Design a protein around this ligand. Structure first.
Ligand SMILES: [Cl-]
Ligand SMILES: [Cl-]
Ligand SMILES: [Cl-]
Ligand code: NA
Lengths: 428, 428, 428
């Protein structure tokens, strides 16, 4: 499949993004439990108590049993509101997080994908370089069988041949481990991916750094949270201060209670005291409570809440310094990426001709084998460097998008285009 | 000492593994505090209170003093149990952790040990390459003193000589800092370690990836915790639900209370009210409590508990995707490791011969010094690469063991064998 | 500006160090809230309750309203003290942290600064090496226009020229991103910084490792906290044990309460019961409470507190093994740094001569272009390696100071001296 398909297969199964989802869901569901306390609280009670006096109470025993139905209602309790508010701001922050986590699934899938591609290039270029050092090998031998070149010419091309093999060895191990990477992110294994279409490839000067910086300054998901979080630090200052406000609660209830006495001092005296009482009651009331002074606590708290607010602020600064540095760097790099794709595109030609000469010359005694084998090594580097440069350019784009905090499923389509030629991921 | 000894000296002192032990110990000891609440709670109270009426109560004062001995016992409180259970599942997870931390002391000690070894190799091979570029140096000089070679031949071998020195310099600094590494992990310094016995060295094709994967899928300590932890998430769902259940506690007590009145309204009225009371009481009772409705709280909690359960699940998927990627990579690498040890074992020969030629040729004006100094550099790389490949093979074995979650003191013995020749760790 | 100025401009704005400050401030301000509970707790209450009997209580209703002014005072409550103490020890640890965070602003600013310097060197040395491969290029062309050199001589110098360009490209991108680094730490952009004065440069053998180790063993901020934190672990053991001690609190209050009855059974009976009661009361008292047995809880806790104390101990060991490894490494590195500055200072000469030969020879057909272009590449490496070695030496000094835990604004001045020549940070 291609980038845009491999992505979607992951967006519906990546355990990391889902875990992040479930974390946002809990965060919001919690807003309920937060408001919960502002609502009616109904409970049922019932007791049974056997008493037994033993001094002036001697000879007096009793069996009472009650069962009330109590209800509570907050009339004015600032902290109970504060809490609800804060749980909401928290869910909000958790959301900005989930979004950030969504962007990461993109950058990481795209990167993982172009690693399996660059992995393939390295292998192919290593097989081309091997096949070359082989022709050159086979040839120094013929030229040596007619005494037109020392034995060293054959011993040299053999040595550099064995060496390329040790590489082709690992270059193939990497294409493998690069697919295990993709597998883990997307959850799948791919027989083939759509390779970068080198003909239709074109770089594109990036927006001026200034425009980039200014949108990121208003969209970068990281900066956004430092903002939300600073707000939350302020909201908490208020919370601390509520410790000074008074509260008004309402209570209501209806209960029955049946008591029965027994014992010495019960048999006689009468006085209608020890008669079995069977009470019934209905109640409603208001409770006002106001802190007057609590050992300095409420202020020590309000101060702390403010220092923590300063901290939240310093972190906002950091977030911003970071969103800046990330933007300028991403700008610099994408440019240097385009600039490098050119230099190497070039070097791959100057090295191709030079190799063609050395080879041609070697065949008529004008060029040394060392010159050939070195021209060969030079070409197959410029070749990989160029291949590599292209992938970094593609990624650097995604980086700027992410630094702006606007990296999405679309940016992943714009790239799904420069892809085309279906190549195998298996090193057969 | 050797690997198997250096390990044991660390297993009894590594501050990280011990810190992890103490963490498992606390975790289990806590299971007590968790059950604690399900047992009898006995306390002693005693008060003294001076009252002083001031309205209809004016002229009525009192001095009362009490002292009860209370006891509480949970009869049916689901959450109290739930708690115990959860504290147990927690200790369990903490155990799986400790085990994981035990494996790491192995892998890290073995690795730290083979780094001091590979560090030694780099130093030796750098000293051999220096001693070579010296002979070749001393020689281009004699050949130059008989005008058989330009001055450049001596200036070239000198330059490349100074360069090897700049290396031998750092290669020796690394053998040092490589020993500081081992020191930190084992707590000791070693004058010498058992070096890899290159003659008896043999690679061993690893188990099919499929078998590997399947055992890891049932032993990998990481995958194990994702399982334990997912269970815990479920256990917590139940816990949330317990908020709906009612509870039944039993209370018992025996207390005395002596009150004495005094004042205006006390001098006369009598009525046997203001007579000094000296009460005695014994009580036992049951208390039933049942939530009827708590502002939606209990469900908002049960929902949250479930979302968190989803998260626990997604992480189990991550654990698994990881155990897979780790097994398959470890398999790939160990193979590539064996495959590489061969290629380099080979290249060390093809490069040995080619160097012997260049040298032989240079001595009879047939080969250039550049050709000699380059053949020299080529040999002493293939030599190190091979040396290095062997160590990685050894480690890659330990890795697969770790991915399976069965890496133990034995696997550290199997390797203690390919060791032998006691080499110094000091670069004299 | 120079290092010592760039530093001060950051020390008054670095959002990370400020955030750390605010964290230490809260930590100390909290010591109040910790002591808070040991002081008088004054509150105001007032209720209103309408009762309505409905069985034996039928026909009896009431309207009562109260309003007390309560005060509480801890007489002897160990845990309330313990808490204050612990909050103090915590602020203490938070302080050692802030200090550590202060050192880091130094090391990081110095490093960010010397990276912008080494970044400049790499660019300059790459421009010198480019200007060289250009002269040599232009020359092989003239030598080629007189059939005195094959076409390959011009094709070779061209290829290696394009290659240096691909580098000069990135070396300039790095000087940029190296300035973004400084910007983020200091908050500023610098047109120019004081470059290392290469003439007045001299290395200085570091104190013996033993003296270094012994001071660090008594000043290293990291080892210090492991100590503070181990103490705190002990303090928490005591805290656990306080769960066995009894507590003595004092209460005091003055409240009024006005009750008024009404209803069927109220109209008549009289008996002076249903008359409106208007009570007044003043109270003071002592409350003694002593745990007798709490399901094993208090011990399960004291045990845990001890296992955690073992952990705190193991970590102290880790801290120490680390302070050791850090000192020894810094010692080793600064030495190897001095030793390396020498080897490269040397190699820059042996490579300078050899290049001068090759060039001289090439001009009279005695030396090959490949020999020239390689002597050129060899020189402009030893040159950078030397430049680089110097910077590492400077840093390694700062590292040892830090390992001792005495790195300060002064050490940043001693270095501000080896600086001088104002160089631009812009790659014009
Ligand atoms: Cl207060
Ligand atoms: Cl509910
Ligand atoms: Cl106990
Ligand atoms: Na694979």
């Amino acid at each position: 499949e291609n980038l845009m398909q491999v992505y979607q297969q992951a967006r519906l199964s990546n355990p990391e993004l889902r875990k992040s989802a479930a974390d946002r869901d809990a965060a919001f569901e919690k807003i309920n439990e937060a408001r919960s306390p502002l609502l009616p609280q109904l409970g049922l009670g019932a007791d049974y108590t056997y008493s037994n006096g033993y001094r002036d109470a001697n000879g007096i025993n009793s069996n009472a049993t009650s069962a009330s139905l109590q209800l509570t209602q907050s009339i004015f309790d600032m902290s109970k509101w504060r809490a609800l508010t804060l749980q909401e701001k928290a869910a909000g922050i958790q959301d900005v997080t989930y979004q950030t986590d969504q962007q990461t699934l993109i950058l990481n899938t795209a990167t993982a994908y172009f690693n399996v591609l660059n992995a393939i290039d390295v292998l192919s270029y290593t097989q081309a370089q091997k096949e070359a050092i082989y022709r050159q090998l086979d040839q120094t031998t013929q030229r040596f069988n007619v005494g037109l070149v020392a034995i060293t010419d054959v011993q040299n091309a053999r040595a550099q041949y064995d060496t390329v093999l040790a590489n082709e060895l690992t270059a193939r191990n990497n294409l493998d481990n690069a697919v295990e990477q993709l597998r883990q992110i997307t959850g799948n294994y791919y027989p083939e991916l759509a390779a970068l279409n080198v003909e239709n490839f074109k770089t594109d000067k990036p927006q001026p750094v200034n425009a980039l910086l200014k949108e990121a300054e208003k969209r970068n998901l990281s900066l956004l949270q430092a903002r939300l979080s600073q707000d939350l630090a302020r909201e908490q200052i208020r919370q601390a201060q509520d410790g000074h406000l008074p509260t008004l609660d309402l209570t209501a209830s209806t209960g029955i209670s049946d008591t029965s006495y027994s014992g010495s001092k019960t048999r006689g005296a009468a006085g209608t005291q020890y008669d079995d009482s069977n009470m019934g009651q209905n109640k409603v009331g208001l409770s006002f409570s106001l802190p007057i002074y609590q050992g300095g606590m409420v202020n020590s708290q309000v101060k702390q809440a403010q220092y923590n607010f300063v901290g939240a602020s310093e972190q906002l600064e950091s977030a911003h310094r970071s969103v800046v540095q990330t933007v300028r760097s991403s700008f610099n790099n994408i440019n240097a990426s385009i600039s490098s794709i050119n230099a190497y595109k070039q070097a791959v030609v100057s090295a191709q001709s030079s190799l063609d000469a050395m080879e041609a010359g070697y065949s008529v005694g004008t060029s040394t084998i060392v010159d050939v084998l070195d021209a060969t090594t030079t070409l197959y580097n410029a070749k990989q460097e160029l291949a590599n440069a292209r992938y970094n350019y593609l990624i650097n784009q995604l980086n700027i998008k992410s630094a702006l905090g606007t990296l999405n499923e679309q940016d992943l389509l714009a790239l799904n285009n420069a892809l085309s030629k279906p190549v195998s991921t298996n090193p057969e």
